[PDB]
Amino acid sequence: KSYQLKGVKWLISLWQNGLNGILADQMGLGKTIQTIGFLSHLKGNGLDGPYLVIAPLSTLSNWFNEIARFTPSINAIIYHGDKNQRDELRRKHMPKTVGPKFPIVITSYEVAMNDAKRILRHYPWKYVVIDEGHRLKNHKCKLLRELKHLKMDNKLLLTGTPLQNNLSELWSLLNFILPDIFTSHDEFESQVVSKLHGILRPFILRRMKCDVELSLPRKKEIIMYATMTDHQKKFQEHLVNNTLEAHLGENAIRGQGWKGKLNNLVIQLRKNCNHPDLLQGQIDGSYLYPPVEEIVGQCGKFRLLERLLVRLFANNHKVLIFSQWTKLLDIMDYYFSEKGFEVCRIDGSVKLDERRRQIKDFSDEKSSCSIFLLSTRAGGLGINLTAADTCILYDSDWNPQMDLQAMDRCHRIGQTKPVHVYRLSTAQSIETRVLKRAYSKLKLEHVVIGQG
Amino acid sequence: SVETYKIYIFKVLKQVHPDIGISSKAMGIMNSFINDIFEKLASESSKLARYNKKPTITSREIQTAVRLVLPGELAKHAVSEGTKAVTKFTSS
Amino acid sequence: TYKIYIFKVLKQVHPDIGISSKAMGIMNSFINDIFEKLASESSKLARYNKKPTITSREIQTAVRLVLPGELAKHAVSEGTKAVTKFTSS
Amino acid sequence: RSSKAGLQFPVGRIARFLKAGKYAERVGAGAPVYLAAVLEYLAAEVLELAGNAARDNKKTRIVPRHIQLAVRNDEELSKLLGDVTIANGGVMPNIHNLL
Amino acid sequence: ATSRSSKAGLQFPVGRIARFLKAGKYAERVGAGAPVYLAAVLEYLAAEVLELAGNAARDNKKTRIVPRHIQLAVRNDEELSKLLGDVTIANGGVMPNIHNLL
Amino acid sequence: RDNIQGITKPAIRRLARRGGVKRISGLIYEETRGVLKIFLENVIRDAVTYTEHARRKTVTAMDVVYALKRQGRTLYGFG
Amino acid sequence: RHRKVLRDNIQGITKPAIRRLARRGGVKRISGLIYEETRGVLKIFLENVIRDAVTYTEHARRKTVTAMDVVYALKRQGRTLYGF
Amino acid sequence: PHRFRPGTVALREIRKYQKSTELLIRKLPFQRLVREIAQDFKTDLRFQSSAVAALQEAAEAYLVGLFEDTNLCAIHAKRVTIMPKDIQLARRIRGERA
Amino acid sequence: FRPGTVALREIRKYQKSTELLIRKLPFQRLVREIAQDFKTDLRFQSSAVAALQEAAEAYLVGLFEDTNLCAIHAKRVTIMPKDIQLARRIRGE
DNA sequence: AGAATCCCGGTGCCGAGGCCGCTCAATTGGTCGTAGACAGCTCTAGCACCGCTTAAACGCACGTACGCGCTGTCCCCCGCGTTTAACCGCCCAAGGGGATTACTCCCTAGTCTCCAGGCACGTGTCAGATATATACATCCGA
DNA sequence: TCGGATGTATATATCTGACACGTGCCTGGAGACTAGGGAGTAATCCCCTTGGGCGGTTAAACGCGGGGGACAGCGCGTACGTGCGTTTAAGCGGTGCTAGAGCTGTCTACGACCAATTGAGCGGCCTCGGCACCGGGATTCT
Ligand SMILES: Nc1ncnc2c1ncn2[C@@H]1O[C@H](COP(=O)(O)OP(=O)(O)O)[C@@H](O)[C@H]1O
Ligand code: BEF
């Protein structure tokens, strides 16, 4: 907790100079067990005044829970939903009169964006705190426009991956967290590496997973390729050439003359490399999910998952599965549910309070729902799964920092068992192209880390 | 780079209703109307010169293009005004 | 008039049928009407693209725009066959 | 040029348009003048009706609805613009043989 | 001096079509395949109508095509009735049509 | 001159019979007499304009065919 | 067995939309067989226009249907469209 | 006396006039009509004798077309008789003057 | 309210407005499926699909208001598919 | 009597109107060659008067069957309320597509030279018209 | 259900006047060179159509009274169809006879082409108020 005591030493300092800061603390530690600490440091004597917290739907819940467990009594309230939010607005506390009962205002990015009018009226907010800074990495996003209408006399940004894509996301954030850094001229950084470290030493504060305490044994991220099977090769060529919509149209049970999905070959070849059923399910209606239930073994990457999982049940340590889409997680669930495994799943389609209890059950150690399906953006940010021990990323791309945030989900203060990561992939395929692109993006990331 | 009839329609409107203004959608509607009418009259004049054997489009067959393209009471005024201009153009 | 040529085509499809003096007038009017429809559609097609030449692509698009579906489908093949025989042979 | 004629439209641009579209080989001198006068006349008769329809609605700026109403009331213009649909102009309100 | 029609294998006058395309100045220049294509299309349409008219004349047990037969052939067929939708063949007449008691 | 009455009732009945009609009401005749005059006025007003453009004093047979083609009514058989 | 969640696009034109169109036409009562008749005349009209607007696009060597092809296709059928 | 039932001599007339191609109005009154109409636009006119023929044959093909769809309006309304209502309906959903 | 009184409310409400009565996304999906049978692998400008909807809705509104003259001619108030067919029979479609 | 509605004070904000630096369009002047207008003549083209025949229009009487109104039944469409899922949506990503400008060639427009077509006019040879005749088929009334 | 009134449908003829070839010049073909440039086929930067998501929350879908509109049937009587005996007037043929439409010859004016200006308009800077846009109450309503 020492680091977290240096985390509260530096946000009490920021409060002093009248500065704004980007808490880029390492993901998987501190942050919130450090945000509420600063918030009690001021709620004591300094009160709360207009205090507003905005965060992703999944975290809002975890935050309320943490408040209920770390702080003895912080008047707080979760302003979630619409129309039902109108009643709690006043059964909250006086309109603008801020007393020892004025409850902490916790909202979401949608609510904040859709009805800023309501909160626009409130006094200069003592401290607006935005949980996931990456949300504002675009300088034309409508949330940013609506976020300026608020009269804010102080700002704060929490994150763990400040830059992911390029430097312009650093540029857009700065202007926001600190408009004293307007610099709306492409920036002057572009030797210079040191010059950038002069501007950024004052605010950015990052730690590291190694820190000092052993706690979490080192993790291992390892890539285990698979060999594309014959049928997938047949599908791939019939696309590299053409007439796939027709050779497969030979069946085409539904949507006769199914639209040639000949767009962005990369994508219609990645979907193949994920599982060929995705293509077959559309060209031919096939109301029936693969009835043989061993046609799933035609996918090479599926067969490597299966064997991995049989060897990881040999020990039973709970696994984690990630994917880019939700059709593919669905195929997986079908497959395993036929064998009989009990699965829990939280994608974006599932509701909020529904997914919160699923975790509260998955977190129940006695219950044997070991498997846990989870889509990237779905619930790869803000969820503690110390119960699980192994993360399998079926597929992820276009932004490497997307994946990391997931791995940490399992690997976070309190995870005693050492963590592995199994980035599956298919050798000599479109997947490797993406893998190399990701490596390129990381290359940039490591030049950024050398900067650090 | 893109030429239209915006200036001239605006000046005509200020000449008719000194205080009314016009939005952009209505301005586009009015531009399209003028283009449509120009194309109609010009194509009819060309074809009508082609019926006779003449390679020249004079003013007196802008007359009859107008009398074929415009209906009744609308043409009898337009024709008149046309003659007006031409007289004031030449005996100037 | 096209009468000569019209008569030739008749003696190809019905070698034993003749034609009344008025029916040949009808056929002449029909040919003169179709030619002018196609030649004006080609003119518009060339002017919409700012080209000063009416090649055999303007004629093909004018046929697709003017003739009804199954009729246009066969007219196009006839014409392309003629142009191929013209240039190659 | 087109100040000697009392017109508000460009005779020079009209002549450029007429000679560009290759409607004929030679274009006379009174042809752009005649065609530019008969266009400002039609513009002036549509705009007056549209402004009158604007005045009734207690408005000071014409909108597409006003052009629609002005065209659909008058008989001559409705006969001339009989197959045109003024993008977003509504319809002329009408009820038949029932309350 | 072989004519253009024989080179194209047609019966219509490719050269006279090219002259008709020039005169009237539909544009400035005219390609070398435009009149061949246009003449081939005109011959095709002519043979279509004449074949239907000859069938209609045989059906009426005649051997000479008259306007009535052209009317019958045009207004029986689908594409031709669409194309010649609003044309009046003179000295032809409407086809038989009685509906209901009327 | 009452030359619209020269379109007699038997001729209108003949036209209706060629149209397929079985019974005629007694008020059809004055309606038909009026809707024929409008058609003729439109066509003749265009034909005479074509005539006066040519500086001729005789309405000819293309003036009529051109007037008809202009109003959607193509006519074959007259040049 | 699950998975299949598809419907003829023709239905996306819903009964309330057809009633709104009829109400703007002046109609007071509507039989229940109107909807499948309107939904069939609309498709005929629409595929007559798209077929010409795509032909106008194939001539120009383009791959994008522009708002001007559609205007020309509509003018070919006797209906003029002002304002784009 | 031997009479026919009402509407049997009318059906043989429909068959008679739908096989012939002749011109069903008297030629002189039609010419007087068109001369009276043209007497407004220009006075002292001359009519080439093939122009009045074109006019007559353009005018009857119009009335025959109008009658065969004022007879679709009558059958839509559960009748066999045509009244002026049918002509007005037909002309109004053709746009002839709307 | 009694049957037939909030209908006239709708005739009055919808003849004053100017906005579009078909939902945009399903109409776009329809116009895309009925062009797959002329040219595969085709894209539309966003203003090309707004122009198709403006013309289609105008067409349907214009057809509904003479389909209503046919129903009144037959002494009814309810439009039936027989009326649409009479209206399209005479307009020429 | 519970339901329907306009007008009048309160609200922002972004599109219409001004300014602008400009550069490429439209003006003035000057030549040339060939479309105008025009005058003269000729021969078609149009119109009009007359007498005769006969076919069509016109008036009329009956009678009937089709239009129109009134009444009853039942069914299906409308209005309202609840619950589900979809369009107007915030974000994500690569891309292909689309209007740009490049020397390069060859492919149309000319100016001409003659063989070739075609169009007009002068003749016969019908073949589908028409009238008389003969069955073979159909409305009609009882 | 027959027997009768006619109505169309087959078969004899003549009889045109037309449709078919064969001439005649005379204008349009095709053929050969030359010129200019108009496409053609490249190379590049981009604004731009094309997938996922993901919320969410209007709008769509479902169901339930219950009346009011469609449709069938029945009666009456009025207007239109059929057939017959007059009454016009269109339509065959003969006279002319002017008022045009068509072609050619001749000169003067008018429009295309081309050089050198310069002030019109177009794309892109800002700035403020007439659109909207919200509650909040008096008034109709069926
Ligand atoms: N200072 C602390 N005291 C007690 N438990 C702690 C402390 N820091 C971390 N933890 C435990 O580790 C978990 C992970 O830390 P958390 O604050 O959730 O991380 P993150 O920074 O990702 O939000 C906490 O939920 C809690 O159980
Ligand atoms: F709140 Be932590 F980033 F999971």
Coordinates of N, CA and C in Angstrom, one line a residue, chain F residues 3-70:
Chain F
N3 N -70.8 23.7 -84.8 CA -70.1 22.6 -85.5 C -69.7 21.5 -84.5
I4 N -69.9 21.7 -83.2 CA -69.7 20.7 -82.2 C -70.9 19.8 -82.1
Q5 N -72.1 20.3 -82.5 CA -73.3 19.5 -82.6 C -73.2 18.5 -83.8
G6 N -72.3 18.8 -84.8 CA -72.1 17.9 -85.9 C -71.4 16.6 -85.6
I7 N -71.0 16.5 -84.3 CA -70.6 15.2 -83.8 C -71.9 14.5 -83.2
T8 N -72.5 13.7 -84.0 CA -73.9 13.3 -83.7 C -73.9 12.1 -82.7
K9 N -75.0 11.9 -82.1 CA -75.2 10.8 -81.1 C -74.9 9.4 -81.7
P10 N -75.3 9.1 -82.9 CA -74.9 7.8 -83.4 C -73.4 7.6 -83.5
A11 N -72.6 8.6 -83.9 CA -71.2 8.5 -84.0 C -70.5 8.2 -82.7
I12 N -71.0 8.9 -81.6 CA -70.5 8.7 -80.3 C -70.8 7.3 -79.8
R13 N -72.0 6.8 -80.1 CA -72.3 5.4 -79.8 C -71.4 4.5 -80.5
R14 N -71.1 4.7 -81.8 CA -70.2 3.9 -82.5 C -68.8 3.8 -81.9
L15 N -68.3 5.0 -81.4 CA -67.0 5.1 -80.8 C -67.0 4.3 -79.4
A16 N -68.1 4.4 -78.7 CA -68.3 3.7 -77.4 C -68.3 2.2 -77.7
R17 N -69.0 1.8 -78.7 CA -69.1 0.4 -79.1 C -67.7 -0.2 -79.4
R18 N -66.9 0.6 -80.2 CA -65.5 0.2 -80.4 C -64.7 0.2 -79.1
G19 N -65.1 1.0 -78.1 CA -64.5 1.0 -76.8 C -64.9 -0.2 -75.9
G20 N -66.0 -0.9 -76.2 CA -66.4 -2.0 -75.4 C -67.6 -1.7 -74.6
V21 N -68.3 -0.6 -74.7 CA -69.4 -0.2 -73.8 C -70.7 -0.9 -74.2
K22 N -71.5 -1.2 -73.2 CA -72.8 -1.9 -73.5 C -74.0 -1.0 -73.3
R23 N -74.0 -0.1 -72.3 CA -75.1 0.8 -72.1 C -74.5 2.2 -71.9
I24 N -75.2 3.2 -72.5 CA -74.8 4.6 -72.4 C -75.9 5.4 -71.7
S25 N -75.5 6.2 -70.7 CA -76.5 7.1 -70.1 C -76.7 8.3 -71.1
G26 N -77.8 9.0 -70.9 CA -78.2 10.0 -71.8 C -77.5 11.3 -71.7
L27 N -76.6 11.5 -70.7 CA -75.8 12.7 -70.5 C -74.4 12.5 -70.9
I28 N -74.0 11.4 -71.5 CA -72.6 11.2 -71.9 C -72.3 12.1 -73.1
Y29 N -73.3 12.3 -74.0 CA -73.0 13.0 -75.2 C -72.5 14.4 -75.0
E30 N -73.1 15.2 -74.1 CA -72.7 16.5 -73.9 C -71.3 16.6 -73.1
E31 N -71.0 15.5 -72.4 CA -69.7 15.4 -71.8 C -68.6 15.1 -72.8
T32 N -68.8 14.1 -73.7 CA -67.9 13.8 -74.7 C -67.7 15.0 -75.7
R33 N -68.7 15.7 -76.0 CA -68.6 16.8 -76.9 C -67.7 17.9 -76.3
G34 N -67.7 18.0 -75.0 CA -66.8 19.0 -74.3 C -65.4 18.5 -74.1
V35 N -65.2 17.2 -73.9 CA -63.8 16.7 -73.8 C -63.1 16.5 -75.1
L36 N -63.8 16.5 -76.2 CA -63.2 16.5 -77.5 C -62.6 17.8 -77.9
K37 N -63.4 18.9 -77.5 CA -63.0 20.2 -77.9 C -61.7 20.6 -77.2
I38 N -61.4 20.1 -76.0 CA -60.2 20.5 -75.3 C -59.0 19.9 -76.0
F39 N -59.1 18.6 -76.3 CA -58.1 17.9 -77.0 C -57.7 18.6 -78.4
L40 N -58.8 18.9 -79.1 CA -58.6 19.6 -80.4 C -57.9 20.9 -80.2
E41 N -58.4 21.7 -79.2 CA -57.8 23.0 -79.0 C -56.3 22.9 -78.7
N42 N -55.9 22.0 -77.8 CA -54.5 21.8 -77.5 C -53.7 21.5 -78.8
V43 N -54.1 20.5 -79.5 CA -53.3 20.0 -80.7 C -53.3 21.1 -81.8
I44 N -54.4 21.8 -82.0 CA -54.4 22.8 -83.1 C -53.6 24.0 -82.7
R45 N -53.7 24.4 -81.4 CA -52.8 25.5 -81.0 C -51.4 25.2 -81.1
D46 N -50.9 24.0 -81.0 CA -49.5 23.7 -81.3 C -49.2 23.6 -82.8
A47 N -50.1 23.1 -83.5 CA -49.9 22.9 -85.0 C -49.8 24.3 -85.6
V48 N -50.7 25.2 -85.3 CA -50.7 26.6 -85.9 C -49.4 27.3 -85.5
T49 N -48.9 27.1 -84.3 CA -47.6 27.7 -83.9 C -46.5 27.2 -84.8
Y50 N -46.4 25.9 -85.0 CA -45.5 25.3 -86.0 C -45.6 25.9 -87.4
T51 N -46.9 26.1 -87.8 CA -47.1 26.7 -89.1 C -46.6 28.1 -89.2
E52 N -46.9 29.0 -88.2 CA -46.5 30.4 -88.3 C -45.0 30.5 -88.1
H53 N -44.4 29.6 -87.5 CA -42.9 29.7 -87.4 C -42.3 29.6 -88.8
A54 N -42.8 28.7 -89.7 CA -42.3 28.5 -91.0 C -42.7 29.6 -92.0
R55 N -43.5 30.6 -91.5 CA -44.0 31.7 -92.4 C -45.0 31.2 -93.5
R56 N -45.6 30.0 -93.2 CA -46.6 29.5 -94.1 C -48.0 29.8 -93.7
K57 N -48.9 29.7 -94.7 CA -50.3 30.0 -94.4 C -51.2 28.7 -94.6
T58 N -50.5 27.5 -94.5 CA -51.3 26.3 -94.7 C -50.8 25.3 -93.6
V59 N -51.7 24.9 -92.7 CA -51.4 23.9 -91.7 C -51.2 22.7 -92.5
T60 N -50.0 22.1 -92.4 CA -49.7 20.9 -93.2 C -49.7 19.6 -92.3
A61 N -49.2 18.5 -92.7 CA -49.3 17.2 -92.0 C -48.2 16.9 -91.0
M62 N -47.1 17.6 -91.0 CA -46.1 17.4 -90.0 C -46.3 18.3 -88.9
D63 N -46.9 19.5 -89.1 CA -47.2 20.4 -88.1 C -48.1 19.6 -87.1
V64 N -49.0 18.8 -87.6 CA -49.9 18.0 -86.8 C -49.1 16.9 -86.1
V65 N -48.3 16.1 -86.9 CA -47.5 15.0 -86.3 C -46.5 15.5 -85.3
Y66 N -45.9 16.7 -85.5 CA -45.0 17.2 -84.5 C -45.7 17.7 -83.3
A67 N -46.9 18.3 -83.4 CA -47.7 18.7 -82.3 C -48.1 17.5 -81.5
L68 N -48.4 16.4 -82.2 CA -48.9 15.2 -81.5 C -47.7 14.5 -80.7
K69 N -46.5 14.4 -81.4 CA -45.3 13.7 -80.7 C -44.9 14.5 -79.5
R70 N -45.1 15.8 -79.5 CA -44.7 16.7 -78.4 C -45.6 16.4 -77.1

